[PDB]
Design an enzyme around this catalytic site. Structure first.
Site, mmCIF file in Angstrom:
data_model
loop_
_atom_site.group_PDB
_atom_site.id
_atom_site.type_symbol
_atom_site.label_atom_id
_atom_site.label_comp_id
_atom_site.label_asym_id
_atom_site.label_seq_id
_atom_site.Cartn_x
_atom_site.Cartn_y
_atom_site.Cartn_z
ATOM 1 N N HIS A 123 -14.508 -41.357 -19.381
ATOM 2 C CA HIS A 123 -13.128 -41.692 -18.933
ATOM 3 C C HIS A 123 -12.673 -40.726 -17.832
ATOM 4 C CE1 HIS A 123 -11.380 -39.006 -22.289
ATOM 5 N NE2 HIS A 123 -10.998 -38.459 -21.139
ATOM 6 N N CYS A 128 -9.845 -33.131 -23.324
ATOM 7 C CA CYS A 128 -10.996 -34.048 -23.445
ATOM 8 C C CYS A 128 -12.256 -33.322 -22.981
ATOM 9 C CB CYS A 128 -10.771 -35.343 -22.697
ATOM 10 S SG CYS A 128 -9.407 -36.269 -23.431
ATOM 11 N N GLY A 169 -5.921 -32.833 -20.947
ATOM 12 C CA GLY A 169 -6.845 -31.879 -20.322
ATOM 13 C C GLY A 169 -7.880 -31.350 -21.305
#
Ligand code: O3R
Ligand code: O3R
EC number: 3.4.19.12
Lengths: 304, 304
Positions: B41, B145, B143
């Protein structure tokens, strides 16, 4: 979102942990620059620990009696001195992994991370608070002495704790890195009862703010209170008195949630008086007091 | 003694964390050997995340569109591929800090440490469990991830989790390091409701053994039960059914405390039926389920 009892990343401290052996006692040391810091009780045998005369015991010890091992490499001890309850072993090699660091003495209610170690090797990291009775509720087995507590501001490790003992009551006592015990404790196998383990009110309030900020809202009520009225209830429940300084420290969280500090005090007052009624806040059935207001902001803002 | 929710020391994993930017999306990557692993993503914009076609989005991206920064030094991306829900960015430099490592897919009820990161920089470490509904209850801001979950056996890091999202319900979902989500979750901003968050019975039992071993004994009763009788109560309280495999896994703790597993089940049964009555176990007012039997033995035996 979500709120966890978070420790500082331990890497900068892992790189400082060494093994110190004196005779048949092995524990952990902290290697910063060309000094290894360890509990002075490393010099103590079985019979010594009931009433050790550290000055007299230390006379019988030379530099070569302190075996300092960093990984599986031996460090050469070129000097030793006792400062309060810690030994400083001067070695001939600066720790190449020495981080930026400070020695700080923390106040009761302040939180820090412990890196639990055995034989100079890290076992685990956890967050705790200096209790108001100057104990910590740790996880320490025999061999864990010399494990340290710390905070990190960006790249600077502030060392605040070195583990020295579990007291008769199953609670923990230790020193700052100048070797001064927190509270009245001594490095001697004797009767050492802790005082009242009061709840760190300002931390509970911080954690209620964290709860609101991460969606647990059920305990918010229609009430307010005053410091004096709240403190009458705090006293009753063995909570630390709340001061205007604590209110000022909570100012950030008050602003964000738009909940006045005194309104949150009134929420806490009802929780104290009424209990949780089988409900939970941030996955806890009791009011958590090992997050400082600074911790809640740090975790909610993602500081690295 | 004393029993703490302990994370693994994070240093070996800190040395693997990098920043990955693609266009205007920045998150974390894991640098092992000459590969950086990150959530796919990272290629997604604002409007992309409602129903992203990752194959189509990835066509528009070249190696030079993936900005990989290790500390404040840029790594050169010489290849990229999508494996399930992760991207593998081949870089021209092996991570000099690559630890011994494995990729494992864990079972629900297994625990691991998370190193929460932002911009490839560590913020904190905490212990959690893969829930029976394949969520985790984490602490993740935007942030975070690409932050990873792991276990350590001596010097070998077993990576088991990479963070991909917070679901509508404020719970967390992610993948193993092959990019397969735990549970039914997808990397898409859509309705994704979690199933029942059942309690990990075998872990509760482990933690009751930890409690006995560290002196909290009050909940020990005069009773025993059978797996079938216990499981009737487990069912009623949204506890995972206890199997003979779980009994076998608890054998070590049963032996040490000399408390039969079925006697501890009978203690747990009364706690479920009667509540804590305002009492605590290892500083908790609810029955803790994020310690595995292996964790309790590890912490009680001081493995490094
Ligand atoms: C838990 N612990 C180590 C220990 C104890 C008993 C055994 Cl069986 C073992 Cl294996 C290890 C200590 C040691 C000294 C003290 S004190 N300062 O009150 O005497 C307290 N706790
Ligand atoms: C908490 N979080 C980030 C966030 C949210 C709102 C704001 Cl105000 C800010 Cl600053 C940041 C997300 C983001 C997406 C989703 S989801 N997959 O259900 O759409 C859930 N949670």
């Amino acid at each position: 979102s979500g709120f966890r009892k978070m420790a500082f990343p331990s890497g900068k401290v892992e790189g400082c942990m060494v093994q110190v052996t004196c005779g048949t006692t092995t524990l952990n040391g902290l290697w910063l620059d060309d000094v290894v810091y360890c509990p002075r009780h490393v010099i103590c045998t079985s019979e010594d620990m009931l009433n050790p005369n550290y000055e007299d015991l230390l006379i019988r010890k030379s530099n070569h009696n302190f075996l300092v091992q960093a990984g599986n490499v031996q460090l050469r001890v070129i000097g030793h001195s006792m400062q309060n309850c810690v030994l400083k072993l001067k070695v001939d090699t600066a720790n190449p992994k020495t981080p930026k660091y400070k020695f700080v003495r923390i106040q009761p209610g302040q939180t820090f991370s412990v890196l639990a170690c055995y034989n100079g090797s890290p076992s685990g990291v956890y967050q705790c608070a200096m209790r108001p009775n100057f104990t910590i509720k740790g996880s320490f087995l025999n061999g864990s002495c010399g494990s340290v507590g710390f905070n990190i501001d960006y790249d600077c490790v502030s060392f605040c704790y070195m583990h020295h003992m579990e007291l008769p009551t199953g609670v923990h006592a230790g020193t700052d890195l100048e070797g001064n015990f927190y509270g009245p404790f001594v490095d001697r196998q004797t009767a050492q009862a802790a005082g009242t383990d009061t709840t760190i009110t300002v931390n509970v309030l911080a954690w209620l703010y964290a709860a609101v900020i991460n969606g647990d809202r059920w305990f918010l009520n229609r009430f307010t209170t005053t410091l004096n009225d709240f403190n009458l209830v705090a006293m009753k429940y063995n909570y630390e008195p709340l001061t205007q300084d604590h209110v000022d420290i909570l100012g950030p969280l008050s602003a964000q949630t738009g909940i006045a500090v005194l309104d949150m005090c009134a929420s806490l007052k009802e929780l104290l008086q009424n209990g949780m009624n089988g409900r939970t806040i941030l996955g806890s059935a009791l009011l958590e007091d090992e997050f400082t207001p600074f911790d809640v902001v740090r975790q909610c803002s993602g500081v690295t």
